């Protein structure tokens, strides 16, 4: 009906072009490597790990997810899979290594969001 | 580890639910484990069975003082997903559940004369003593809405544990 | 290369005339928000400058050497011939 599907796409594309950071894809087997990927890293602090509320020790880990552009993944030949690692090569991100765990359902035209886990 | 070998054996046992083996569903490479969350990378490939462990830290029945050998009652939360029929929202899960139960039974299923039907499978090769399948639950998600059908099947594995060689 | 640049400008002209249409009708986007809760605000389009850009493009397309006629860089003042 409307052109909103394209407006939304261009919006997401500009959001990425402005807020993305470079990354490196290293697959689980480390057989293939793809550098200079652009991803957006969303990290929120979490304290987790206690079974039920048994009184076990928690660890501090993030609730975090990485936004990709699908066009770029297809262009660069990247087939994201569980266990694959994203390294943040930007200066000052300490080469944080993020292990892809599971993918969020693709809603919308430009981006795909993976829930990941900090590994270092 | 003992527990891990048992889990791998159950997995590879269910990963033989395949159309080439006389089952209506193909689970090869899709009996997952240790995942608390399954996203589009998985749901885009149903049917999928996942075997997690129950969050309860039970105490076993010890065979000795010095409390070294015990019979565990290790509960495993077998569950599975398969794309439903929107007009029969949960019929598919009963069929997959049936295949999974039928496969698991192979481990304990004796013939009518008391002899094992599948002696090499029987008890996973002496790894387990018991396999108590609970009454399975097929339900829609209690809150939220899905075209993915859920079945929930607790499995109590009985196994002898000697913590000297766990 | 001339015709590759001409096609470049033809596509840009398509986009610009569509933008001018949407702009005069009041359908030119200045803000977008998705249910993702992510937002994008744009510098407002101006009808004068957009028409002028359209004219640059059409003129370059009409010219033999579009990539030069677009910028008009080597300008010179108009003289007059008298009867």
mmCIF file of C-alpha atoms in Angstrom:
data_model
loop_
_atom_site.group_PDB
_atom_site.id
_atom_site.type_symbol
_atom_site.label_atom_id
_atom_site.label_comp_id
_atom_site.label_asym_id
_atom_site.label_seq_id
_atom_site.Cartn_x
_atom_site.Cartn_y
_atom_site.Cartn_z
ATOM 1 C CA UNK A 1 0.000 0.000 0.000
ATOM 2 C CA UNK A 2 2.555 2.514 1.188
ATOM 3 C CA UNK A 3 6.274 2.982 0.585
ATOM 4 C CA UNK A 4 6.969 2.379 4.258
ATOM 5 C CA UNK A 5 8.791 -0.870 3.534
ATOM 6 C CA UNK A 6 11.456 1.123 1.689
ATOM 7 C CA UNK A 7 11.475 3.974 4.180
ATOM 8 C CA UNK A 8 12.082 1.472 6.963
ATOM 9 C CA UNK A 9 14.865 -0.163 4.968
ATOM 10 C CA UNK A 10 16.655 3.104 4.283
ATOM 11 C CA UNK A 11 16.231 4.080 7.926
ATOM 12 C CA UNK A 12 17.828 0.869 9.158
ATOM 13 C CA UNK A 13 20.579 1.210 6.556
ATOM 14 C CA UNK A 14 21.421 4.716 7.740
ATOM 15 C CA UNK A 15 21.264 3.653 11.384
ATOM 16 C CA UNK A 16 23.815 0.976 10.592
ATOM 17 C CA UNK A 17 26.022 3.212 8.472
ATOM 18 C CA UNK A 18 26.150 5.630 11.389
ATOM 19 C CA UNK A 19 26.347 3.370 14.455
ATOM 20 C CA UNK A 20 28.100 0.242 13.175
ATOM 21 C CA UNK A 21 31.561 -0.867 14.269
ATOM 22 C CA UNK A 22 34.012 -3.148 12.452
ATOM 23 C CA UNK A 23 34.154 -6.826 13.299
ATOM 24 C CA UNK A 24 35.773 -10.066 12.229
ATOM 25 C CA UNK A 25 33.914 -13.306 11.622
ATOM 26 C CA UNK A 26 35.683 -16.476 12.730
ATOM 27 C CA UNK A 27 33.700 -19.643 12.237
ATOM 28 C CA UNK A 28 33.556 -22.345 14.879
ATOM 29 C CA UNK A 29 36.078 -24.514 13.054
ATOM 30 C CA UNK A 30 38.172 -21.394 12.351
ATOM 31 C CA UNK A 31 38.514 -22.701 8.799
ATOM 32 C CA UNK A 32 37.303 -19.411 7.294
ATOM 33 C CA UNK A 33 37.750 -15.789 8.331
ATOM 34 C CA UNK A 34 36.007 -12.628 7.145
ATOM 35 C CA UNK A 35 37.328 -9.299 8.354
ATOM 36 C CA UNK A 36 35.986 -5.742 8.244
ATOM 37 C CA UNK A 37 32.384 -6.685 8.921
ATOM 38 C CA UNK A 38 30.082 -3.964 10.214
ATOM 39 C CA UNK A 39 28.001 -4.915 13.245
ATOM 40 C CA UNK A 40 26.163 -3.145 16.035
ATOM 41 C CA UNK A 41 26.865 -4.566 19.480
ATOM 42 C CA UNK A 42 24.151 -4.234 22.118
ATOM 43 C CA UNK A 43 25.268 -5.118 25.628
ATOM 44 C CA UNK A 44 23.339 -4.895 28.871
ATOM 45 C CA UNK A 45 24.817 -5.977 32.170
ATOM 46 C CA UNK A 46 23.353 -9.094 33.726
ATOM 47 C CA UNK A 47 24.040 -11.081 36.866
ATOM 48 C CA UNK A 48 23.133 -14.696 36.238
ATOM 49 C CA UNK A 49 23.951 -18.297 37.008
ATOM 50 C CA UNK A 50 22.157 -19.196 40.244
ATOM 51 C CA UNK A 51 20.032 -22.343 40.014
ATOM 52 C CA UNK A 52 16.515 -21.533 41.112
ATOM 53 C CA UNK A 53 17.359 -19.420 44.097
ATOM 54 C CA UNK A 54 19.456 -22.043 45.846
ATOM 55 C CA UNK A 55 21.997 -19.556 47.096
ATOM 56 C CA UNK A 56 24.618 -20.278 44.474
ATOM 57 C CA UNK A 57 27.130 -17.744 43.249
ATOM 58 C CA UNK A 58 26.152 -15.528 40.355
ATOM 59 C CA UNK A 59 28.498 -14.433 37.611
ATOM 60 C CA UNK A 60 28.394 -11.125 35.803
ATOM 61 C CA UNK A 61 27.670 -11.560 32.116
ATOM 62 C CA UNK A 62 25.896 -9.529 29.512
ATOM 63 C CA UNK A 63 22.523 -9.787 27.876
ATOM 64 C CA UNK A 64 23.810 -8.961 24.441
ATOM 65 C CA UNK A 65 22.929 -9.190 20.774
ATOM 66 C CA UNK A 66 24.612 -8.221 17.526
ATOM 67 C CA UNK A 67 22.910 -6.553 14.576
ATOM 68 C CA UNK A 68 24.080 -7.449 11.077
ATOM 69 C CA UNK A 69 23.116 -6.287 7.638
ATOM 70 C CA UNK A 70 21.980 -9.236 5.553
ATOM 71 C CA UNK A 71 23.211 -7.692 2.306
ATOM 72 C CA UNK A 72 26.742 -7.566 3.684
ATOM 73 C CA UNK A 73 26.676 -11.168 4.887
ATOM 74 C CA UNK A 74 25.538 -12.338 1.466
ATOM 75 C CA UNK A 75 28.081 -10.081 -0.253
ATOM 76 C CA UNK A 76 31.001 -11.307 1.846
ATOM 77 C CA UNK A 77 29.863 -14.935 1.812
ATOM 78 C CA UNK A 78 29.075 -15.234 5.513
ATOM 79 C CA UNK A 79 26.777 -18.008 6.691
ATOM 80 C CA UNK A 80 26.256 -17.262 10.361
ATOM 81 C CA UNK A 81 25.796 -20.323 12.529
ATOM 82 C CA UNK A 82 25.644 -21.262 16.177
ATOM 83 C CA UNK A 83 29.088 -21.293 17.720
ATOM 84 C CA UNK A 84 30.525 -18.829 15.229
ATOM 85 C CA UNK A 85 32.495 -16.000 16.784
ATOM 86 C CA UNK A 86 32.423 -12.254 16.209
ATOM 87 C CA UNK A 87 35.561 -10.364 17.198
ATOM 88 C CA UNK A 88 35.278 -6.608 17.650
ATOM 89 C CA UNK A 89 38.448 -5.314 16.034
ATOM 90 C CA UNK A 90 37.620 -1.684 16.748
ATOM 91 C CA UNK A 91 40.209 0.031 18.888
ATOM 92 C CA UNK A 92 39.256 -0.048 22.535
ATOM 93 C CA UNK A 93 36.831 -2.960 22.354
ATOM 94 C CA UNK A 94 39.615 -5.293 23.548
ATOM 95 C CA UNK A 95 38.948 -7.656 20.625
ATOM 96 C CA UNK A 96 35.884 -8.930 22.437
ATOM 97 C CA UNK A 97 34.891 -12.313 21.060
ATOM 98 C CA UNK A 98 31.161 -12.918 20.827
ATOM 99 C CA UNK A 99 29.806 -16.413 20.332
ATOM 100 C CA UNK A 100 26.633 -16.638 18.277
ATOM 101 C CA UNK A 101 24.044 -18.637 20.200
ATOM 102 C CA UNK A 102 20.697 -18.269 18.444
ATOM 103 C CA UNK A 103 19.075 -15.968 15.931
ATOM 104 C CA UNK A 104 16.135 -13.691 16.459
ATOM 105 C CA UNK A 105 13.343 -14.062 13.894
ATOM 106 C CA UNK A 106 13.928 -11.766 10.947
ATOM 107 C CA UNK A 107 11.387 -8.967 11.132
ATOM 108 C CA UNK A 108 12.015 -6.353 8.499
ATOM 109 C CA UNK A 109 14.012 -5.768 5.395
ATOM 110 C CA UNK A 110 17.619 -4.926 6.242
ATOM 111 C CA UNK A 111 18.958 -6.475 9.406
ATOM 112 C CA UNK A 112 19.263 -9.757 11.233
ATOM 113 C CA UNK A 113 19.799 -9.893 14.977
ATOM 114 C CA UNK A 114 21.737 -12.641 16.711
ATOM 115 C CA UNK A 115 21.763 -13.230 20.432
ATOM 116 C CA UNK A 116 25.357 -13.871 21.434
ATOM 117 C CA UNK A 117 27.554 -14.606 24.422
ATOM 118 C CA UNK A 118 30.762 -12.929 25.510
ATOM 119 C CA UNK A 119 33.622 -15.417 25.584
ATOM 120 C CA UNK A 120 36.922 -13.566 25.349
ATOM 121 C CA UNK B 1 32.089 -38.631 32.316
ATOM 122 C CA UNK B 2 29.318 -41.107 33.003
ATOM 123 C CA UNK B 3 26.436 -38.662 32.749
ATOM 124 C CA UNK B 4 27.832 -37.193 29.555
ATOM 125 C CA UNK B 5 28.291 -40.557 27.887
ATOM 126 C CA UNK B 6 24.704 -41.427 28.771
ATOM 127 C CA UNK B 7 23.465 -38.161 27.308
ATOM 128 C CA UNK B 8 25.465 -38.623 24.120
ATOM 129 C CA UNK B 9 24.083 -42.139 23.813
ATOM 130 C CA UNK B 10 20.493 -40.975 24.202
ATOM 131 C CA UNK B 11 21.186 -38.269 21.640
ATOM 132 C CA UNK B 12 22.715 -40.623 19.080
ATOM 133 C CA UNK B 13 19.877 -43.023 19.860
ATOM 134 C CA UNK B 14 17.263 -40.413 18.997
ATOM 135 C CA UNK B 15 19.299 -39.116 16.056
ATOM 136 C CA UNK B 16 18.345 -42.432 14.456
ATOM 137 C CA UNK B 17 14.704 -41.435 14.283
ATOM 138 C CA UNK B 18 14.899 -41.121 10.531
ATOM 139 C CA UNK B 19 12.762 -41.902 7.527
ATOM 140 C CA UNK B 20 15.405 -44.366 6.364
ATOM 141 C CA UNK B 21 14.923 -46.203 9.687
ATOM 142 C CA UNK B 22 11.143 -46.489 9.501
ATOM 143 C CA UNK B 23 10.038 -43.344 11.290
ATOM 144 C CA UNK B 24 7.915 -40.556 9.868
ATOM 145 C CA UNK B 25 10.249 -37.840 11.159
ATOM 146 C CA UNK B 26 13.911 -37.095 10.541
ATOM 147 C CA UNK B 27 15.846 -36.055 13.641
ATOM 148 C CA UNK B 28 19.378 -36.682 12.424
ATOM 149 C CA UNK B 29 21.541 -33.790 13.514
ATOM 150 C CA UNK B 30 18.582 -32.233 15.313
ATOM 151 C CA UNK B 31 18.562 -33.804 18.780
ATOM 152 C CA UNK B 32 20.102 -30.803 20.470
ATOM 153 C CA UNK B 33 21.308 -30.525 24.024
ATOM 154 C CA UNK B 34 22.406 -27.936 26.537
ATOM 155 C CA UNK B 35 20.476 -25.146 24.820
ATOM 156 C CA UNK B 36 18.009 -23.189 26.927
ATOM 157 C CA UNK B 37 16.932 -21.098 23.940
ATOM 158 C CA UNK B 38 16.218 -22.074 20.338
ATOM 159 C CA UNK B 39 15.829 -19.324 17.757
ATOM 160 C CA UNK B 40 15.263 -19.011 14.040
ATOM 161 C CA UNK B 41 18.422 -20.919 13.253
ATOM 162 C CA UNK B 42 16.679 -23.872 14.832
ATOM 163 C CA UNK B 43 12.973 -23.276 14.433
ATOM 164 C CA UNK B 44 13.625 -22.932 10.723
ATOM 165 C CA UNK B 45 14.533 -26.597 10.767
ATOM 166 C CA UNK B 46 11.827 -28.400 12.753
ATOM 167 C CA UNK B 47 11.264 -31.063 14.007
ATOM 168 C CA UNK B 48 13.821 -30.629 16.785
ATOM 169 C CA UNK B 49 14.207 -32.528 20.056
ATOM 170 C CA UNK B 50 16.108 -31.047 22.973
ATOM 171 C CA UNK B 51 17.240 -32.933 26.044
ATOM 172 C CA UNK B 52 17.922 -30.744 29.060
ATOM 173 C CA UNK B 53 18.358 -31.805 32.668
ATOM 174 C CA UNK B 54 16.010 -30.915 35.473
ATOM 175 C CA UNK B 55 17.102 -28.118 37.771
ATOM 176 C CA UNK B 56 16.614 -30.233 40.912
ATOM 177 C CA UNK B 57 19.619 -31.398 42.958
ATOM 178 C CA UNK B 58 18.272 -34.660 44.308
ATOM 179 C CA UNK B 59 20.040 -37.084 46.631
ATOM 180 C CA UNK B 60 20.477 -40.660 45.516
ATOM 181 C CA UNK B 61 19.915 -43.920 47.326
ATOM 182 C CA UNK B 62 23.283 -45.011 48.651
ATOM 183 C CA UNK B 63 24.392 -48.625 48.567
ATOM 184 C CA UNK B 64 26.970 -48.232 51.312
ATOM 185 C CA UNK B 65 28.007 -46.203 54.231
ATOM 186 C CA UNK B 66 30.781 -43.822 53.162
ATOM 187 C CA UNK B 67 28.071 -42.787 50.695
ATOM 188 C CA UNK B 68 30.115 -43.493 47.587
ATOM 189 C CA UNK B 69 27.830 -45.656 45.410
ATOM 190 C CA UNK B 70 24.255 -44.610 44.714
ATOM 191 C CA UNK B 71 21.264 -45.064 42.442
ATOM 192 C CA UNK B 72 20.447 -41.729 40.846
ATOM 193 C CA UNK B 73 16.990 -40.701 39.614
ATOM 194 C CA UNK B 74 18.353 -38.386 36.958
ATOM 195 C CA UNK B 75 15.489 -36.503 35.345
ATOM 196 C CA UNK B 76 15.893 -35.349 31.750
ATOM 197 C CA UNK B 77 13.505 -32.862 30.176
ATOM 198 C CA UNK B 78 12.973 -34.186 26.688
ATOM 199 C CA UNK B 79 10.994 -31.735 24.610
ATOM 200 C CA UNK B 80 10.444 -31.180 20.945
ATOM 201 C CA UNK B 81 9.038 -28.795 18.406
ATOM 202 C CA UNK B 82 7.279 -29.356 15.108
ATOM 203 C CA UNK B 83 5.335 -26.950 12.945
ATOM 204 C CA UNK B 84 1.671 -27.343 13.751
ATOM 205 C CA UNK B 85 -1.529 -27.502 11.742
ATOM 206 C CA UNK B 86 -3.280 -24.163 12.350
ATOM 207 C CA UNK B 87 -6.660 -25.912 12.279
ATOM 208 C CA UNK B 88 -5.377 -28.815 14.414
ATOM 209 C CA UNK B 89 -2.928 -26.802 16.452
ATOM 210 C CA UNK B 90 -1.285 -29.661 18.363
ATOM 211 C CA UNK B 91 -1.851 -32.902 16.454
ATOM 212 C CA UNK B 92 1.674 -33.074 14.945
ATOM 213 C CA UNK B 93 3.366 -33.130 18.330
ATOM 214 C CA UNK B 94 1.556 -36.276 19.402
ATOM 215 C CA UNK B 95 3.060 -38.141 16.455
ATOM 216 C CA UNK B 96 6.631 -36.990 17.083
ATOM 217 C CA UNK B 97 6.169 -37.687 20.778
ATOM 218 C CA UNK B 98 5.030 -41.170 19.821
ATOM 219 C CA UNK B 99 8.098 -41.789 17.681
ATOM 220 C CA UNK B 100 10.350 -40.564 20.484
ATOM 221 C CA UNK B 101 8.640 -42.706 23.117
ATOM 222 C CA UNK B 102 8.783 -45.722 20.821
ATOM 223 C CA UNK B 103 12.496 -45.147 20.288
ATOM 224 C CA UNK B 104 13.279 -44.630 23.967
ATOM 225 C CA UNK B 105 11.322 -47.738 24.924
ATOM 226 C CA UNK B 106 13.753 -49.775 22.840
ATOM 227 C CA UNK B 107 16.174 -49.368 25.734
ATOM 228 C CA UNK B 108 13.997 -51.188 28.267
ATOM 229 C CA UNK B 109 11.376 -52.853 26.109
ATOM 230 C CA UNK B 110 11.283 -56.553 26.829
ATOM 231 C CA UNK B 111 9.428 -58.975 24.630
ATOM 232 C CA UNK B 112 6.391 -60.839 25.909
ATOM 233 C CA UNK B 113 8.676 -63.605 27.207
ATOM 234 C CA UNK B 114 10.909 -61.357 29.295
ATOM 235 C CA UNK B 115 13.790 -61.086 26.982
ATOM 236 C CA UNK B 116 15.140 -57.829 25.559
ATOM 237 C CA UNK B 117 13.819 -56.937 22.129
ATOM 238 C CA UNK B 118 16.928 -54.949 21.132
ATOM 239 C CA UNK B 119 19.739 -56.333 23.282
ATOM 240 C CA UNK B 120 22.460 -53.964 22.096
ATOM 241 C CA UNK B 121 20.301 -50.927 22.821
ATOM 242 C CA UNK B 122 18.919 -52.388 26.026
ATOM 243 C CA UNK B 123 19.868 -49.975 28.795
ATOM 244 C CA UNK B 124 22.292 -48.230 26.421
ATOM 245 C CA UNK B 125 24.728 -51.039 27.086
ATOM 246 C CA UNK B 126 24.482 -51.257 30.849
ATOM 247 C CA UNK B 127 24.952 -47.519 31.214
ATOM 248 C CA UNK B 128 21.474 -47.043 32.678
ATOM 249 C CA UNK B 129 19.354 -49.200 34.933
ATOM 250 C CA UNK B 130 15.952 -47.603 34.391
ATOM 251 C CA UNK B 131 14.048 -45.298 32.065
ATOM 252 C CA UNK B 132 10.765 -44.065 33.524
ATOM 253 C CA UNK B 133 8.893 -42.071 30.906
ATOM 254 C CA UNK B 134 6.438 -39.632 32.393
ATOM 255 C CA UNK B 135 2.999 -38.902 31.063
ATOM 256 C CA UNK B 136 3.817 -36.435 28.276
ATOM 257 C CA UNK B 137 2.309 -32.996 27.933
ATOM 258 C CA UNK B 138 1.304 -31.514 24.604
ATOM 259 C CA UNK B 139 0.068 -27.970 24.970
ATOM 260 C CA UNK B 140 0.217 -24.599 23.346
ATOM 261 C CA UNK B 141 2.477 -22.133 25.123
ATOM 262 C CA UNK B 142 0.637 -20.815 28.145
ATOM 263 C CA UNK B 143 1.235 -17.197 27.215
ATOM 264 C CA UNK B 144 2.227 -16.290 23.713
ATOM 265 C CA UNK B 145 1.023 -17.774 20.463
ATOM 266 C CA UNK B 146 2.776 -20.035 17.984
ATOM 267 C CA UNK B 147 2.441 -22.216 14.916
ATOM 268 C CA UNK B 148 5.058 -24.415 16.573
ATOM 269 C CA UNK B 149 3.775 -27.417 18.485
ATOM 270 C CA UNK B 150 5.341 -28.290 21.819
ATOM 271 C CA UNK B 151 5.649 -31.642 23.534
ATOM 272 C CA UNK B 152 7.137 -32.058 26.995
ATOM 273 C CA UNK B 153 8.413 -35.450 28.134
ATOM 274 C CA UNK B 154 10.314 -35.929 31.391
ATOM 275 C CA UNK B 155 12.565 -38.982 31.497
ATOM 276 C CA UNK B 156 13.959 -40.312 34.769
ATOM 277 C CA UNK B 157 17.164 -42.168 33.988
ATOM 278 C CA UNK B 158 18.237 -44.564 36.703
ATOM 279 C CA UNK B 159 21.959 -45.165 36.837
ATOM 280 C CA UNK B 160 24.539 -46.442 39.281
ATOM 281 C CA UNK B 161 26.988 -43.721 40.265
ATOM 282 C CA UNK B 162 30.278 -44.442 41.986
ATOM 283 C CA UNK B 163 31.814 -41.046 42.667
ATOM 284 C CA UNK B 164 35.231 -42.683 42.600
ATOM 285 C CA UNK B 165 34.689 -43.054 38.837
ATOM 286 C CA UNK B 166 31.742 -40.705 38.073
ATOM 287 C CA UNK C 1 33.073 7.700 -19.291
ATOM 288 C CA UNK C 2 30.292 9.853 -20.773
ATOM 289 C CA UNK C 3 27.372 7.428 -21.101
ATOM 290 C CA UNK C 4 28.085 5.619 -17.852
ATOM 291 C CA UNK C 5 27.892 9.010 -16.137
ATOM 292 C CA UNK C 6 24.749 9.824 -18.115
ATOM 293 C CA UNK C 7 23.095 6.655 -16.831
ATOM 294 C CA UNK C 8 24.269 7.468 -13.319
ATOM 295 C CA UNK C 9 22.550 10.832 -13.596
ATOM 296 C CA UNK C 10 19.445 9.287 -15.153
ATOM 297 C CA UNK C 11 18.994 7.060 -12.118
ATOM 298 C CA UNK C 12 19.707 9.983 -9.806
ATOM 299 C CA UNK C 13 17.129 12.030 -11.708
ATOM 300 C CA UNK C 14 14.549 9.294 -11.290
ATOM 301 C CA UNK C 15 15.147 9.373 -7.541
ATOM 302 C CA UNK C 16 15.124 13.163 -7.413
ATOM 303 C CA UNK C 17 11.910 13.622 -9.369
ATOM 304 C CA UNK C 18 10.204 11.009 -7.206
ATOM 305 C CA UNK C 19 11.444 12.902 -4.163
ATOM 306 C CA UNK C 20 10.119 16.173 -5.579
ATOM 307 C CA UNK C 21 6.743 14.570 -6.176
ATOM 308 C CA UNK C 22 6.569 13.223 -2.639
ATOM 309 C CA UNK C 23 7.820 16.559 -1.302
ATOM 310 C CA UNK C 24 5.178 18.757 -2.880
ATOM 311 C CA UNK C 25 2.472 16.274 -1.914
ATOM 312 C CA UNK C 26 3.756 16.224 1.653
ATOM 313 C CA UNK C 27 5.084 12.682 1.612
ATOM 314 C CA UNK C 28 8.776 13.466 2.025
ATOM 315 C CA UNK C 29 10.132 11.737 5.091
ATOM 316 C CA UNK C 30 11.781 13.756 7.829
ATOM 317 C CA UNK C 31 11.475 11.252 10.686
ATOM 318 C CA UNK C 32 11.194 7.476 10.833
ATOM 319 C CA UNK C 33 10.716 5.219 13.831
ATOM 320 C CA UNK C 34 10.465 1.449 13.702
ATOM 321 C CA UNK C 35 8.813 -0.884 16.172
ATOM 322 C CA UNK C 36 12.443 -1.771 16.905
ATOM 323 C CA UNK C 37 12.399 1.556 18.811
ATOM 324 C CA UNK C 38 15.110 2.868 16.493
ATOM 325 C CA UNK C 39 14.818 6.324 15.016
ATOM 326 C CA UNK C 40 16.143 8.309 12.082
ATOM 327 C CA UNK C 41 15.659 12.016 11.484
ATOM 328 C CA UNK C 42 16.503 13.621 8.170
ATOM 329 C CA UNK C 43 17.465 17.104 7.126
ATOM 330 C CA UNK C 44 14.365 18.529 5.515
ATOM 331 C CA UNK C 45 14.298 18.647 1.746
ATOM 332 C CA UNK C 46 13.978 22.055 0.102
ATOM 333 C CA UNK C 47 11.894 22.473 -3.026
ATOM 334 C CA UNK C 48 14.079 25.146 -4.617
ATOM 335 C CA UNK C 49 17.353 23.295 -4.175
ATOM 336 C CA UNK C 50 15.825 20.007 -5.256
ATOM 337 C CA UNK C 51 14.391 21.530 -8.409
ATOM 338 C CA UNK C 52 17.783 23.070 -9.116
ATOM 339 C CA UNK C 53 19.463 19.687 -8.640
ATOM 340 C CA UNK C 54 16.943 18.157 -11.025
ATOM 341 C CA UNK C 55 17.831 20.839 -13.551
ATOM 342 C CA UNK C 56 21.556 20.189 -13.156
ATOM 343 C CA UNK C 57 20.940 16.512 -13.794
ATOM 344 C CA UNK C 58 18.658 16.983 -16.784
ATOM 345 C CA UNK C 59 21.110 19.466 -18.279
ATOM 346 C CA UNK C 60 24.049 17.101 -17.836
ATOM 347 C CA UNK C 61 22.038 14.282 -19.390
ATOM 348 C CA UNK C 62 21.291 16.587 -22.311
ATOM 349 C CA UNK C 63 24.949 17.536 -22.657
ATOM 350 C CA UNK C 64 27.544 15.514 -24.535
ATOM 351 C CA UNK C 65 29.884 15.359 -21.506
ATOM 352 C CA UNK C 66 27.605 14.966 -18.483
ATOM 353 C CA UNK C 67 30.317 14.656 -15.856
ATOM 354 C CA UNK C 68 31.571 18.133 -16.755
ATOM 355 C CA UNK C 69 28.207 19.814 -17.315
ATOM 356 C CA UNK C 70 26.920 18.698 -13.921
ATOM 357 C CA UNK C 71 29.497 20.668 -11.960
ATOM 358 C CA UNK C 72 29.765 23.506 -14.461
ATOM 359 C CA UNK C 73 33.135 24.149 -12.872
ATOM 360 C CA UNK C 74 34.872 26.094 -15.700
ATOM 361 C CA UNK C 75 32.180 28.747 -15.734
ATOM 362 C CA UNK C 76 32.563 32.040 -17.542
ATOM 363 C CA UNK C 77 30.372 35.139 -17.592
ATOM 364 C CA UNK C 78 27.788 35.680 -20.292
ATOM 365 C CA UNK C 79 28.781 38.327 -22.770
ATOM 366 C CA UNK C 80 26.459 40.193 -25.052
ATOM 367 C CA UNK C 81 26.283 40.726 -28.798
ATOM 368 C CA UNK C 82 24.684 43.930 -29.926
ATOM 369 C CA UNK C 83 22.782 44.613 -33.175
#
